[PDB]
Amino acid sequence: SRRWFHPNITGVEAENLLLTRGVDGSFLARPSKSNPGDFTLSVRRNGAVTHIKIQNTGDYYDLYGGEKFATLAELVQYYMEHHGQLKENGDVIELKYPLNCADPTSERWFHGHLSGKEAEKLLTEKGKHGSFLVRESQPGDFVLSVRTGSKVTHVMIRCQELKYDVGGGERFDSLTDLVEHYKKNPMVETLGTVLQLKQPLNTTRINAAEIESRVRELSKLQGFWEEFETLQQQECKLLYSRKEGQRQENKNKNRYKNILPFDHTRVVLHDGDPPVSDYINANIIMPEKSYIATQGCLQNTVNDFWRMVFQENSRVIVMTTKEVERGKSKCVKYWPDEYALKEYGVMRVRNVKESAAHDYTLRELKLSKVGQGNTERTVWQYHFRTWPDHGVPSDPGGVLDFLEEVHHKQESIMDAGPVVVHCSAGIGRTGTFIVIDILIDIIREKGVDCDIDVPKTIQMVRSQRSGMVQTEAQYRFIYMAVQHYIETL
Numbered sequence: 001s002r003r004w005f006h007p008n009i010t011g012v013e014a015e016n017l018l019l020t021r022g023v024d025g026s027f028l029a030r031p032s033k034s035n036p037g038d039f040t041l042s043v044r045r046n047g048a049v050t051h052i053k054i055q056n057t058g059d060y061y062d063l064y065g066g067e068k069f070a071t072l073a074e075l076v077q078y079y080m081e082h083h084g085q086l087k088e089n090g091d092v093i094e095l096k097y098p099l100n101c102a103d104p105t106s107e108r109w110f111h112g113h114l115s116g117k118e119a120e121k122l123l124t125e126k127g128k129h130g131s132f133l134v135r136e137s138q139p140g141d142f143v144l145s146v147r148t149g150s151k152v153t154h155v156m157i158r159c160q161e162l163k164y165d166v167g168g169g170e171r172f173d174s175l176t177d178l179v180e181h182y183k184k185n186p187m188v189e190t191l192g193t194v195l196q197l198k199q200p201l202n203t204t205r206i207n208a209a210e211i212e213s214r215v216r217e218l219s220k221l222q223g224f225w226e227e228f229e230t231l232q233q234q235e236c237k238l239l240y241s242r243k244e245g246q247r248q249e250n251k252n253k254n255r256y257k258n259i260l261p262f263d264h265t266r267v268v269l270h271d272g273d274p275p276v277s278d279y280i281n282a283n284i285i286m287p288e289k290s291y292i293a294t295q296g297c298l299q300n301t302v303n304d305f306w307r308m309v310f311q312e313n314s315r316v317i318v319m320t321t322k323e324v325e326r327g328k329s330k331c332v333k334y335w336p337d338e339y340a341l342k343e344y345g346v347m348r349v350r351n352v353k354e355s356a357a358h359d360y361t362l363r364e365l366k367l368s369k370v371g372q373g374n375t376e377r378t379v380w381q382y383h384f385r386t387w388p389d390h391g392v393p394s395d396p397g398g399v400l401d402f403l404e405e406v407h408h409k410q411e412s413i414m415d416a417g418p419v420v421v422h423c424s425a426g427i428g429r430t431g432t433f434i435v436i437d438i439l440i441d442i443i444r445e446k447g448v449d450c451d452i453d454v455p456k457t458i459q460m461v462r463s464q465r466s467g468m469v470q471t472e473a474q475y476r477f478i479y480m481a482v483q484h485y486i487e488t489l
C-alpha cells in the first residue's frame with residue numbers, strides 16, 4: 001500500500017495530522033505547495049514535525065539528507081527497513097509508522113461528481129463483468145456502481161459522522177477501506193447476484209484520433225496532475241526484488257546505490273571472465289521491437305556495457321544526456337574519438353564517422369570481439385544533445401524527428417537486437433523516450449484509428465524497470481509528443 005501519500009494537504013495540515021493523530025516515528029509524504037513539482041517528507045520526531053525536501057527534475061527522487069530513489073514507494077520501503085540512514089545537525093530521523101490518507105482522489109475507481117445515467121453510460125461502453133466505480137451522490141453520500149454478466153447495480157454509500165457504510169454492518173474510516181472490504185467479501189443480492197468488484201472502470205484508454213480532445217480536457221484546472229497521481233499510486237504493486245544489484249561485488253557497478261535493476265528483467269551478462277561478471281544496471285523492456293533501459297556508463301562499467309551490446313546483438317544506442325550536465329558527469333565517454341579504434345576489454349570499437357544534426361549527433365560505430373573478425377557489426381549511436389538540464393523540451397518536434405530516424409535505422413537492420421536507451425540513472429528521460437516510442441509504434445502499425453492508453457503503457461514499462469517516467473512534466477510531454485505525431489499524419 002501507498003496510504004502515507006496525501007495528495008491534497010498543506011504543510012500546516014500535515015503538521016496537525018502528525019501532532020493529533022500520529023506518534024514519534026509517524027510520517028507522510030505530500031506534493032510540495034511552495035515548489036510545485038517537488039515533494040515533502042513530513043516526520044514526527046520528539047513531539048515535533050520535520051518537513052524534508054524531495055526533489056525531482058526528471059531523473060530521480062532526491063531526498064535532502066538522504067539518497068536518490070526511483071519511486072516514493074521504493075524510498076519509503078528502504079527507510080522503513082534501514083534505520084540510521086536518514087539524518088537532518090546530523091541527527092537520525094526514523095520512518096516507523098505511515099500516517100494513512102483517507103482521500104479517495106487518486107483511486108482508479110473514484111469519479112467524484114458523476115451522474116447515475118453517465119456512470120451507466122461509461123460502464124456499458126467500457127465496462128465488463130465486475131467493472132466498478134465510486135461517485136458522489138446525487139448528497140454528501142457516495143454511490144458504488146458495478147457491472148455484472150448484463151446489468152448495472154447502484155449501491156448507496158452512506159457517510160455518517162466521517163465513516164462509510166452500505167446501510168448496515170461495518171462502518172469504515174475511508175471509501176478505500178469499504179471498497180477493499182467488499183472487493184474481498186462480495187455483497188450478495190437477495191436473488192443471489194454477487195456484486196463482484198473485479199477491476200475499476202477504465203477512464204484513460206482513448207482513441208488516438210481524439211488525442212487533442214483529451215489533451216484539451218486534461219489541460220483544464222490540472223487534470224494531467226490528477227491522472228499522473230492516479231498512476232503513481234499504482235507503483236506500490238511494483239516493489240520486485242533488486243537483490244543482485246545489492247551484492248557486495250555489484251555495488252560499485254551502480255551510478256546511484258539505491259536505483260537498481262529488477263532481478264526478473266535485468267540483463268544477465270554471459271561473457272564471464274573465468275567471479276561476479278554477470279551484472280549490469282540494465283533491464284530488458286518488452287512492449288506488452290524491444291529495448292534495454294540502462295544508466296550512463298561509469299569508468300568501471302564501460303567494458304560491461306560493450307559486452308551487453310555484443311551479447312544482445314543491439315545495433316542502435318539512444319543516448320539522451322550530455323556527458324556532463326551542470327558540472328556533473330552523467331555518463332563517461334564509452335565510445336572512441338572519430339576515426340579512432342579502442343579496445344574495451346575483450347570488445348573492440350572503431351568510431352567510423354560522426355554526423356551532427358540540429359538536436360543530435362549520430363556516431364557510426366563498428367563493434368567486434370578481439371581475436372574474432374567474423375563478429376563485426378555496425379552500432380549506430382544516436383546522441384540527443386539538446387534536452388534541458390531541468391524539465392522537458394517546450395516543443396516535442398525535435399524528440400519526434402530524432403525518434404523517427406532511430407526507428408527507421410532499427411527497422412532497416414535484419415535481426416537487430418533490442419534498442420539500447422540510456423540517460424544518467426536510466427529511468428526518467430530513458431523512460432519517457434521508450435514510452436513515446438512504444439505509443440507512436442502502436443499508431444504506426446494500427447493507424448490513427450487505434451486505442452492508446454498512456455498510464456497503462458507507463459505501468460507496463462515500470463514493472464520492467466523502476467520509476468520509468470519520473471515526473472508529471474515528462475507525463476504531459478508524452479501526451480504532447482503523441483498529439484504532435486498524430487497532427488503531422
Ligand SMILES: COc1cccc(-c2nnc3n(Cc4ccccc4Cl)c(=O)c4ccccc4n23)c1O
Nearest residue numbers: 077078079081239240241242243246257258259260
Ligand atoms: C517480493 O519483493 C522483494 C523480495 C525480496 C527483496 C526485495 C527488495 N529488493 N530491494 C529491496 N530494497 C532496496 C535496497 C536494499 C538494500 C540496499 C539498497 C536498496 Cl535500494 C529494500 O529496501 C527492501 C526493504 C524491505 C523489503 C524488501 C526490500 N527490497 C523485494 O522488493
